[PDB]
Design an enzyme around this catalytic site. Structure first.
Site, short mmCIF file in Angstrom:
data_model
loop_
_atom_site.label_atom_id
_atom_site.label_comp_id
_atom_site.label_asym_id
_atom_site.label_seq_id
_atom_site.Cartn_x
_atom_site.Cartn_y
_atom_site.Cartn_z
N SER A 22 -34.46 49.56 41.12
CA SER A 22 -34.43 50.35 39.71
C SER A 22 -33.70 51.43 39.77
CB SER A 22 -35.63 50.21 39.02
OG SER A 22 -36.67 51.31 39.81
N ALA A 24 -30.69 54.73 37.68
CA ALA A 24 -30.63 55.58 36.37
C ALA A 24 -29.93 54.70 35.51
CB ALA A 24 -29.72 56.81 36.88
N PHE A 25 -29.00 53.71 36.07
CA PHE A 25 -28.11 52.97 35.16
C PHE A 25 -28.92 51.73 34.79
N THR A 27 -31.81 48.17 35.98
CA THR A 27 -32.78 47.63 37.01
C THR A 27 -32.03 46.42 37.70
OG1 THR A 27 -34.79 48.70 36.15
CG2 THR A 27 -34.92 46.67 37.15
N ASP A 139 -16.67 55.41 42.95
CA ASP A 139 -17.94 55.59 43.70
C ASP A 139 -18.16 54.69 44.89
OD1 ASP A 139 -21.36 55.54 42.35
OD2 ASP A 139 -20.56 56.68 43.92
N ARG A 143 -23.66 52.74 50.29
CA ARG A 143 -24.67 52.34 49.21
C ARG A 143 -24.12 51.37 48.41
NH1 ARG A 143 -23.75 57.68 47.92
NH2 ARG A 143 -22.75 57.60 46.03
N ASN A 144 -23.01 51.20 48.14
CA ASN A 144 -22.25 50.60 47.16
C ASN A 144 -21.41 49.51 47.67
OD1 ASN A 144 -23.30 51.69 45.06
ND2 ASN A 144 -21.65 53.49 44.97
N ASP A 157 -20.41 47.99 42.33
CA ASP A 157 -20.81 49.34 41.47
C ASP A 157 -19.52 49.99 40.93
OD1 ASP A 157 -23.55 48.88 41.90
OD2 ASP A 157 -23.67 50.09 43.64
C1 LIG Z 1 -28.03 50.59 49.19
C2 LIG Z 1 -29.68 50.75 48.33
C3 LIG Z 1 -29.34 49.48 47.31
O1 LIG Z 1 -28.33 49.29 46.83
N1 LIG Z 1 -30.49 48.77 47.03
C4 LIG Z 1 -30.35 47.89 46.17
C5 LIG Z 1 -29.87 46.47 46.63
C6 LIG Z 1 -29.68 45.48 45.62
C7 LIG Z 1 -29.16 44.46 45.75
C8 LIG Z 1 -29.69 43.83 46.72
N2 LIG Z 1 -29.28 42.43 46.82
C9 LIG Z 1 -28.35 42.45 45.85
N3 LIG Z 1 -27.70 41.22 45.54
C10 LIG Z 1 -26.94 41.20 44.48
N4 LIG Z 1 -26.79 42.45 43.93
C11 LIG Z 1 -27.52 43.54 44.17
N5 LIG Z 1 -27.40 44.75 43.35
C12 LIG Z 1 -26.42 44.80 42.31
C13 LIG Z 1 -25.72 46.10 42.07
C14 LIG Z 1 -24.89 46.06 40.81
C15 LIG Z 1 -24.77 45.14 39.89
C16 LIG Z 1 -23.98 45.13 38.97
N6 LIG Z 1 -22.55 44.80 39.06
C17 LIG Z 1 -21.61 45.41 39.57
O2 LIG Z 1 -21.63 46.52 39.87
C18 LIG Z 1 -20.54 44.55 39.76
C19 LIG Z 1 -19.12 44.87 40.09
C20 LIG Z 1 -18.41 43.64 40.05
C21 LIG Z 1 -18.58 42.44 39.54
C22 LIG Z 1 -19.96 42.57 38.99
C23 LIG Z 1 -20.80 43.39 39.24
C24 LIG Z 1 -22.10 43.28 38.81
O3 LIG Z 1 -22.88 42.71 38.42
C25 LIG Z 1 -25.75 44.01 40.19
C26 LIG Z 1 -26.57 43.74 41.38
C27 LIG Z 1 -28.28 43.66 45.17
C28 LIG Z 1 -30.09 45.89 44.29
C29 LIG Z 1 -30.32 47.20 43.98
C30 LIG Z 1 -30.49 48.33 44.94
O4 LIG Z 1 -31.27 49.51 44.40
C31 LIG Z 1 -30.73 49.73 43.20
C32 LIG Z 1 -31.01 51.43 43.07
N7 LIG Z 1 -30.82 52.35 43.81
C33 LIG Z 1 -30.96 53.57 43.35
C34 LIG Z 1 -31.59 52.10 45.13
#
Ligand SMILES: *CCC(=O)Nc1cc(-c2c[nH]c3ncnc(Nc4ccc(CN5C(=O)c6ccccc6C5=O)cc4)c23)ccc1OCCN(C)C
Length: 268
Positions: A22, A24-25, A27, A139, A143-144, A157
């Site tokens: 979870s 700022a943008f 969960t 960005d 991490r992204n 991201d």
């Molecule tokens: C580096 C720390 C981190 O990112 N932790 C973290 C990981 C995940 C995570 C784990 N496994 C995943 N599988 C799929 N997706 C995610 N995360 C996720 C990120 C973004 C989005 C939204 N989204 C896009 O940006 C994007 C771009 C282009 C096309 C589609 C999409 C899209 O759907 C969805 C899923 C996975 C999740 C969360 C994590 O921590 C997040 C908070 N930070 C502060 C730790």
């Protein structure tokens, strides 16, 4: 807009099961997509954005979502579906190994030069694709980047990280493909240091000052001069003196053909 590429989901067609993280943008959840009139349960990630007091119009959200669903590149995440309620929920494939920053920190002693240089190639390919689609990421950071399998990563991201930003972005809010190249160089530095924090111990408020004074991230221990020179070129003050992503693909692809020559890692 190729509307077929984006599934508009009913709330009843997916289920959030586990929390992935979870922020700022919003969960991010691990869950299941259970499309109507199919017979499959698909593991997905679901990002629920925080509700806006003043929401953009759904036509405007959908216009951006269609772009995100149109991305067709192995190294860029694609939007599989969207659910529009009081919130926006984004559905995409699960990336089971998490973000590349965590991955490199957690596997640092088992990561060789071929893995590292392949990741640099893959990220440059994804960024070159985004530039070809006239999309500026703004960005890019380790991490992204998400890890589908250890040697298949994808940028996510897109659609205040001072320590990844080009100096012109810090000072003038100018964002371009060439400021993305600066961020790429910082991302490569993160990988080559096995996930170290850039400018560790320097507050973000001081970053534009040290950059203006000519200081830059230091040469990672494993990096031969050829690799570091590429990174340093990404941090030229003149944005058009930085490499292009197309050139970065070529250069890191050549290095990935002889990885021991370009990175020096105890154990290879
Ligand atoms: C580096 C720390 C981190 O990112 N932790 C973290 C990981 C995940 C995570 C784990 N496994 C995943 N599988 C799929 N997706 C995610 N995360 C996720 C990120 C973004 C989005 C939204 N989204 C896009 O940006 C994007 C771009 C282009 C096309 C589609 C999409 C899209 O759907 C969805 C899923 C996975 C999740 C969360 C994590 O921590 C997040 C908070 N930070 C502060 C730790």
């Amino acid at each position: 807009p190729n509307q077929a590429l984006l599934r508009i989901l009913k709330e009843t067609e997916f289920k959030k099961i586990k929390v992935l993280g979870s922020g700022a943008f919003g969960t991010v959840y691990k869950g299941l997509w259970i499309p109507e009139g199919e017979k499959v349960k698909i593991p997905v990630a679901i990002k629920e954005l925080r509700e806006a007091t003043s929401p953009k119009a759904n036509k405007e959200i959908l216009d951006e979502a269609y772009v995100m669903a149109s991305v067709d590149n192995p190294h860029v995440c694609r939007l599989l579906g969207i659910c529009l309620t009081s919130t926006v929920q984004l559905i995409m494939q699960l990336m089971p190994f998490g973000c590349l920053l965590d991955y490199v920190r957690e596997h640092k002693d088992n990561i060789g030069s071929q893995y590292l240089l392949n990741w640099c190639v893959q990220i440059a390919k994804g960024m070159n694709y985004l530039e070809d689609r006239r999309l500026v990421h703004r960005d890019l950071a380790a991490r992204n980047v998400l890890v589908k399998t250890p040697q298949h990563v994808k940028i996510t991201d897109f659609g205040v990280p001072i320590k990844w930003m080009a100096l012109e972005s810090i000072l003038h809010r100018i964002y371009t493909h060439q400021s993305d190249v600066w961020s790429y160089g910082v991302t490569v530095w993160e990988l080559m240091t096995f996930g170290s924090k850039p400018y560790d111990g320097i507050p973000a408020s001081e970053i534009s000052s040290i950059l203006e004074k000519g200081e830059r991230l230091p040469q990672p221990p494993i990096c031969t001069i050829d690799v570091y020179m590429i990174m340093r070129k990404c941090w030229m003050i003149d944005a058009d003196s930085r490499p292009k992503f197309r050139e970065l693909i070529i250069e890191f692809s050549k290095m990935a053909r002889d990885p021991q020559r370009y990175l020096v890692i105890q154990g290879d």
